[PDB]
């Protein structure tokens, strides 16, 4: 019976495991949560109103195939419905990534959408109604460095709807600073 | 990366026991028709990352199989275990006369199979068969550490049709 | 404020109101309940938990694109996944259909389709919850013939799972006793 | 049939008034990226029955769209409807400059061009699009009994970036 539900990229290198028997995982290309997507919804209606888990985890990576590929202006077919999500991010932020150096774009916008998947978990009607009845319940963005192994929490970290609120807030605000 | 494996969100089941692969996870390793994100995951690597081998890959002692079994009011997962409700009733005469103890694995096995054959009928695979790309798929199951079913294994829709039947056959003794 | 929901085919000549401002209406390919369909459960919860509706209505009919697509062989690309839950269906009672001069089977899938939705509707957890907290509703299947006009109920009917299994066996055993 | 219309499960929005018709329905009338339905729909429509027109009709005093602005555990449904508020925040500053009363209508409107744009972005109708297919793309709004919004109109990717980019500059007037 595991404490942790990770939500992880499909992508090569990027084993929930590995990374970090506790584990409960959901992967699919780039890390998604979809306001509609009954796949990622059932792991995280079981994961929190049947094994009653009290961290969920979003895993983004750099270097990842499906971030590359939302922004390469491709015909791939059916995953280009996937990935327009993804680009629909992008322009959310289009100010902030344009003002960017165009080799830097993908490793911010793999950031940016581990605070927008959170968010959208965030706002679930599992996860507020689980708020709401005082469960305890804890939702984590991160970003994991497959160029250096090392992890690199995000800061998006939400417990109730406000929190959630302030650190989507913030999180983006700290992103829109550029080093 | 030259693998996609396809396995159940449930705890002990890491597709590396057993760099090269591309991972999908979700409540009793289903391909349902209709799914966008397995489909996705599917397409993109048939068709984008020229994935050669598909790999079904379920577990004993599942909690989707056995809450599918169960009648319980769980919400929203039990709409996504209804398809494995379906594939029960399929083959509800064969899990019927067998000892109440033993089904949950038995469907394990029955319910990695009917994956594959949904697999192997997706566009996306067919067509893919059909302009001369190399693809087989895999329906495996896993405990002590080992695979306790091969099974279904198909590289055409006609060794679908004959993989299935056989693997369902034997799964009747 | 409506008192019906209605499903139905997408197909040309088959609209909820004509063909019987109290609708609530969903229409998509095959008139089809899909376990795990986001866009239909919610077109269902909606109905069941908000507006309070009492009769929902599966409607299919003769002569449906649909039907006849998912019964040919063919490569049509997206809608055939969309369609393999109706030929999942065909192979479920293929000993019938099998039994049935090649140009009857259509009509008679069409019928065995509504049965089959219905007994899909039954089972969601949507309308199972609203049966056992003694909400009131009631689920039909109906065929309509384009040929003349003339719909055509098909005696499933269900207000509640045990009546829910009573009419889907019987549907299914009236179907098989062949003219 | 010649036009595939989709438009709002909601009570009194029927496609006929305005054999010809192909109809899909589902609530606040929404073409999201990854709805299996929906798409299907739309590719058997455009793949298929080589439909030319696709029109995306929206409606007055809807009751998705005020569901969607309200704060409300309604359960399943609000999950639809959060592609609605993504929609509200995109223009929220246009929303905001505006008397509370008169909202609903304009994002009404605005929801509309937004699922135009959505669905002139599906690989299906890009890809026809790229083949030399004709298919143009519609959003309008109803009541009276009348339209009271045109509004977004495409015929290629081209036009569909300026018909929508002209579309929500009319709209903030
Ligand atoms: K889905
Ligand atoms: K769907
Ligand atoms: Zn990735
Ligand atoms: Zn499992
Ligand atoms: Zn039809
Ligand atoms: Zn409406």
Redesign the interface.
């Known amino acids: 019976?595991?404490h942790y539900l990770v939500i992880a990229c499909?992508?090569?290198?990027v084993?929930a495991?590995?990374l970090t028997?506790?584990?409960?995982?959901?992967?699919?290309?780039a890390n998604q949560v979809?306001?509609?997507?009954?796949?990622?919804?059932?792991?995280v209606?079981?994961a929190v109103?049947?094994?009653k888990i009290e961290h969920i985890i979003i895993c983004g990576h750099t270097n990842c195939?499906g971030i590359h590929?939302a922004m390469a202006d491709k015909?791939?077919?059916?995953?280009?419905?996937?990935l327009?999500?993804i680009?629909?991010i992008w322009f959310?932020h289009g100010h902030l990534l344009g003002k960017l150096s165009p080799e830097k774009r993908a490793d911010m916008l793999t950031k940016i959408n581990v605070a927008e998947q959170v968010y959208?978990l965030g706002?679930?009607?599992?996860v507020?109604?689980a708020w709401?009845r005082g469960q305890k319940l804890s939702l984590h963005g991160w970003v994991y460095d497959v160029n250096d192994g090392f992890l690199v929490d995000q800061g998006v970290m939400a417990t109730s709807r406000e929190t959630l609120e302030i650190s989507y807030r913030n999180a983006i605000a700290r992103l829109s600073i550029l080093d």
Do not use: M
């Not at 706002?123 to 599992?126: N, P, V």
């Open positions: 019976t595991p499909s992508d090569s290198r084993p495991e590995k028997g506790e584990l409960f995982v959901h992967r699919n290309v979809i306001h509609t997507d009954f796949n990622c919804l059932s792991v209606q079981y109103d049947v094994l195939g590929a015909d791939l077919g059916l995953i280009n419905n996937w327009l999500h680009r629909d959310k959208n706002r679930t009607s599992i507020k109604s709401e």
